[PDB]
Subunit: 498 residues, 4 copies
């Protein structure tokens, strides 16, 4: 029997595993060490969670290695691997309300949104990649023939082997799902390290892999610290690939660690300062709706959030007025209240960073139009914030807040290349967007934006089939889409002479 | 007008540039610093070559950046970029005897081989990749529609931008060509750093780009040290990708440096300890010829050389006997002499390693059947070497020689999995091969070998259309084939709502 | 409420719909016309089935047209189309025993084979193609730019529209599934004409599309004659594509009718005279098992059955003795009995073709080693038959039996090119096979065989991911694999200037 | 030595072969029969050309079959086949002025346009497809494994064999090039039948294949009639594929003949009635320029010409005024004169049809704004024509003119779906276009148009990399792009068990 933290909430009885998941079983960490996970709605302790030690990382990797090399996962047909991943998606769907509730509790995700996105997209991710398993194909290649003999050259796509994945805290289940689905679809086994502050949906997911009949050791989950657990994963001689999403400084470190151990493969998604360019010829009311969403979606805790809005001179003031009108209509509160628009920030230290980010924005001369502070109420709520008169040299024009902070600059009527230059003048390159009714501007601007994703007349429109990843210091490699699979496969060339 | 080192040799008048190649012109390094390049046939100085400094790297990168951002290369059609690369191949073909002679002098490449392979394959490489330019395609993807609206999602394959490539000394022109052809075909610009010991064909190639009409700054070439020039390339904030081929330890350092600067993309080809498994049921005479080739081709200075031969017990002794017969027929001599089939080693420091390598081989208990020593003559010739009775724990069973040293172990008749385990018991995974007439054994062995390339009843059969790269500590990423383009492209996702 | 023919058989209750399926309802044909479907195990009438008339074809096409143009199927996400098809596969699985029992009744399919193949593969087919829906992708193409302007060229993959599929009787559910899964996955709607003699699993399948929630009109099924129903489908101005499997002569007529109406697209799978070449160096026992399978699988009513076996001189007599010994072991009888491994032929007229076929073989001088006659029991059982001394000019060397008749010729030891010539001396080119342990012979033979499928050391190894179709007079176009989708899609090129 | 018709024009000495091209040699037809090719600039006879007979077709096919089966073309590397095609493109470029001049004489192509398009694009076509040769790749497919055994499944892309291509007269060299380049790049051999009225660039092209070193029998060219030569190609038992561009009725007949002989593969490009929708929010002057090019380009003898322009009510009159202004400026004249904008129609019979066409347009009640008549000068010149007040029921709203006749209908302001319906009402679906600055309309309209090509804010922008082909009664199959290759290849599936 699995030990649960039990909690009657949201019309449900949540049953929440809290231990490490190694070789298909939930087990205490070395020395039964634990830590507290904190509810951001009221600052309370949800429960104690096992705190993985180095010896636990080694056990997880050994279980993953054994599962890949000798266990069933390495022997079944691609098609049957596919069936298991579909079945996993089904099981996640059967538990979707419970998962969304756990996410509401652990990450402060608004319940209605956690259902549709955090959980709904996770389900879609597994179903999408499940369909790839038997459609991953190599090549036959018309090489020059060693006359009078003949040659056949083919490629085989093969799994990389044991993978480590390090997840951030903003969408705990969904980031896990993005990377894990592609990893498992390609035939690998995995050790997953969730963000220390958000372990609960990952551990509930682990239990769901058991219900789905995923062979023991294919998935291992180790709550605990990046600098202990994540570090050992990057150093481990039996791990052949790291998939990472998080900050630029940690991504750099992780890549360095992959280098110094055994040149394991690495993919990096490192956040952004993504620009949204709104032209005077756009649909204005839509621009306001999508611009708001571009910033405030999931309380700003969103890798692709627009970190700067460039609004054409002649519509700037009307744009700002409408935004203020819309912001005042936002309902802030408990993520379980069904009319909540804006939930709390993920954890305390992030709230403090947002407070300091906004103090700095004011200090350096930007105009604070709304917000900029903690909402007085228990937990870690931050006021939806609007800054105008933001200039290109300012800190808040360069640094990613990862909070609900709209950062607006004007640009000159009928200038296009000039605004592009300012939009591209970051070392980040994750996402971007443009609002305009003009086909020629939209196409030209999408060509010129230096960003892995460009939205046109929409924002936050990700899709499990559409590859997502950064340029420049936003990193490299894709999650989602066919392209994600290539991070998790190797190519063997086989050349016959006959 | 360009300065040349002129040399009458091989019935040609060689005209060899010796300066840095920057922004379309040959220029002295900072402070007019130079170094000597050594002819390995006799130890003489061929000539003095500019020695690039930090400020020269910055200049090369600035030229590459300008050529990409504002120059013609970034504006022309993919089709026309292709035409220029074809033309470049034609120019190399027109200079094929001269390039082969420079490679003979600089790297000790046997002229007839240099013409067919070092140079001939280089020409094939530029022609092959020229064909890809207008055939690099993104996708349109059927994402979920935001009803009542519609969505269009497409991807664009874009160049990565400024690339640095760092080349080894074993096939100077060919390794340059492999990486440069893919890089340029993808629309990038490049700073190339040849091995310090082998700058000459690179510099001649630089001249050839001028003849072909490649726009100034697209190709920049910097003879000099890896610890100075290579390091700066890996550190440079405007370089977006490093392509590297060389030792595992330098590979690790480069990847580390890519991480710590601007998370530039990196590909690594890092050498190997590649097993060749020879079963009793093979064509024995062919196994001898191809076994010979697998070790001795290009005086063993060959990324994919078989570093271990495993020979089935019942044919082992007869295989060794026949190898000794063939080794005795090898004509050692000046690479310019027509009947030479074993040239000198590339440079002195490499000769020293080979001597030490075989001393250690004898020390640890292997049977030295022939060779092991520097040939008594001027230059840096090394006697074709055969070791038998090699055991798995031995240094020479583990470490890559990169020299003409056949390293032979027995395996028991009828064993298949046991020899596979032994063949896979390395941290390398670059290449491998199997000789057998049994279809079932050949297919099974090719599945089980943990290597990026598996040869079946042949060896050294590379092709410009067939991707080449390693697993495990042999690195990641491919040169050659369609797959190579992916290291030099990025994918932008563009999502419309309408 | 649907009308059923109900029958207690095989430990279950069959509930068989027997009417036309049009616009999501079961309906009588015009004038309530019917015909009898015959159980080949005892010659009895299973039930009466509606006999579609021209006005029923027009009704079915109109419903398909309306479902495509205005109904939900043409509006839902590709992903959701995929979900519906994966649900259809699930419902088929929930009815697997029932479907397999109907197939045993209607087509004489041995129940254990029908479960695993007729039905099992049909389920795989729908799951396979379900996974393609949101992975069908067009391209973005790097065209020459109309300077000083820019161009973007993309392709969209779109459905062709209303399709007609005409199905043979040998694998009623499976042929229906192969073609229908690919058709529906591509977003099309369809009118299916099962072979008149085998309508029952098609009509049960039709009911299953209702349980799966496939929108009305997407699937329409018309039991009836080819010369009436098939013809009108080929002629109809609103049908855009015909998918056909059947005889060469009907294929020709269908293609002609496609031409003369509205140049509707057409695919053709037209049977064959498939050669299996068995070399002396093969595993002989395995060659007997697979050789027997190549002929006798599904009582020889098998598109890809080996129609000639060429056996190397030195093993010929021993191959024949072993075949004779295994044939004696076959249990002929009721397809519903667990012991049976050879069921009756599909229908009476085909039984009489086989009797005549074997008479002609004897008359023209072939040696009848065993079989040749109807088995003396109720129904339409034919004896497993072996002919030897078959010469290239013989009728039975050229004509497709489509029955359990092994047709053996010798070839001289060491012949390879000579046997290949004889094996290719047909206007057919559907399948082929070779048994040999020799890698070089296997690869060479597979290159040289002029057939859409080459089996090596196996036979009948189809798979839902591996495309299947003929060369020459065996037709063109593929079923199964990614390639099948291409028959059911059109490519729209979109070129912007901006 | 080849017989020529020598002619001094355009400051060149033309050397024009005029005989059948069979098996690498120019030969007279059976009975030395000939016919006259007519210069459309003055009605004169250019020269006599051999008139191929049935026995000549058989000789050509026999030569093509021998070249494919036993000749060098079937034996060389894919890479070297490519080299020959790239050399063929070079030879064409060396002869470009001559080829453009022959085309000017034979087809009335304006010389400056023939250089850039008829000839320029032909050269691009051969170069583009030359690059595909060693990049045509099959697959390796992860099929279900016959446990405890293993399976490997791969596909080989193979040539179809002997092909016949049948070309129209509007772009004699370019149409020949589109189809022949893809056909030969795929490894096939070919028998080409140019339109009887335009044999001369085809015959000169034949001579160029000799200068390029294309092996004998690979290309065979048969000037003569469709009903004799084209018919025998469709019926021939050794021909495995027909590529056809022309009228719908001949297309139907061709497909019927493919069916009744040997179910040879067929592709069909059958012309169109392509709509161009011009919205009020477009760039009006650009719409006029592109609108005119959409009709008048190559004197309207253009497969993808806009056959109807729908112009939004509020800009209709101004659009017509501006078109009239621009039409008055077009310079009609000898195609060899540098100032000529508008050359003669291709041949007399076509001129007569255009005259009759416009008589009928006036009769049925459309407003003739200009032209409609043969130009009063020698040869077969037709005045650029503009019709307004065209109604959907009119003959000229339905029938393809294939001449320089702009056919304008109005549509109500704001009426998107209504105009789409009218634009789609036709049984053709070759091309279409839309001019609008509005991104949402542009994307919506392109989804809704039922045509193989949709131009957005441009027209006639074809590219050798962008596939081109029709929907509905405009046929199926693509010329150009990667997709064109699939018409000329077959897929062989090879499945091993081991
Ligand atoms: N299988 C392949 S492809 C291969 C190829 C070469 C060598 N090896 C292995 O390595 C051994 C020889 O070692 P080696 O010294 O000749 O090869 P490496 O040192 O790995 O040299 C490869 C390239 O990297 C450069 N480099 C060195 N330090 C660098 C740094 N900090 N940053 C950037 N670039 C740097 C080198 O420059 P310098 O010119 O200053 O050295 C050279 O151009 C061989 O015996 C063999 O075992 C393998």
């Amino acid at each position: 029997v699995i030990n649960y933290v039990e909690k009657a909430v949201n019309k449900l009885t949540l049953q929440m595993p809290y231990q490490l998941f190694i070789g298909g079983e939930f087990v205490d960490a070395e020395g039964s060490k634990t830590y507290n996970t904190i509810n951001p709605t009221d600052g309370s302790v949800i429960c104690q969670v096992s705190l993985a030690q180095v010896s636990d990382v080694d056990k997880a990797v050994a279980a993953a290695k054994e599962a890949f090399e000798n266990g069933l996962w390495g022997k079944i047909n691609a098609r049957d691997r596919g069936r298991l991943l579909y079945r996993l998606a089904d099981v996640m769907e059967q538990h979707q309300e419970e998962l969304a509730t756990i996410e509401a509790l652990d990450a402060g995700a608004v319940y209605t949104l956690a259902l549709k996105t955090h959980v709904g997209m996770s389900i879609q991710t597994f179903r999408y990649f499940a369909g790839w398993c038997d459609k991953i194909q190599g090549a036959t290649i018309p090489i020059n023939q060693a006359r009078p003999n003949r040659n056949l050259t083919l490629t085989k796509k093969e799994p990389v082997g044991v993978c480590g994945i390090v997840i951030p805290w903003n969408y705990p289940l969904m980031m896990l799902s993005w990377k894990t689905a592609a990893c498992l679809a390609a035939g690998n086994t995995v050790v997953i390290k969730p963000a220390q502050v958000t372990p609960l949906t990952a551990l509930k997911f682990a239990e769901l892999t058991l219900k789905a009949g995923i062979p023991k050791g294919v998935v291992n989950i180790l709550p605990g610290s990046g600098s202990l657990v994540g570090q050992r994963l990057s150093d481990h001689p039996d791990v052949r690939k790291i998939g990472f999403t998080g900050s630029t400084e940690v991504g750099k470190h992780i890549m360095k660690s992959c280098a110094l151990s055994n040149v394991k493969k690495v993919s990096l998604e490192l956040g952004g300062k993504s620009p949204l360019i709104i032209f005077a010829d756009c649909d204005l009311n839509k621009a306001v709706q999508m611009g708001m969403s571009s910033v405030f979606f999931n309380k700003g805790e969103n890798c692709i959030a627009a970190g700067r809005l460039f609004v054409e001179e002649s519509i700037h003031n009307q744009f700002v007025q409408k935004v203020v009108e819309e912001v005042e209509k936002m309902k802030i509160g408990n993520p379980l209240e069904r009319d909540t628009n804006h939930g709390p920030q993920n954890h305390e230290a992030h709230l403090r960073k947002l407070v300091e980010y906004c103090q700095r924005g004011v200090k350096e001369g930007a105009t604070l139009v709304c917000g900029g502070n903690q909402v007085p109420r228990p937990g870690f709520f931050f006021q939806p914030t609007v800054f105008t008169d933001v200039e290109d040299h300012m800190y808040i024009a360069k640094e990613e807040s990862f909070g609900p902070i709209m950062i607006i600059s004007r640009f000159a009527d009928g200038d296009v290349d000039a605004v592009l230059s300012r939009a591209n003048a970051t070392e980040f390159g994750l996402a971007s967007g443009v609002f305009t009714r003009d086909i020629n501007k939209a196409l030209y601007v999408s060509d010129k934006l230096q960003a892995g994703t460009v939205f046109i007349n929409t924002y936050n429109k990700t899709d499990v089939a559409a590859p997502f990843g950064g340029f420049k210091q936003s990193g490299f490699g894709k999650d989602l889409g066919e392209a994600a699979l290539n991070e998790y496969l190797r190519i063997k060339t086989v050349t016959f002479e006959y």
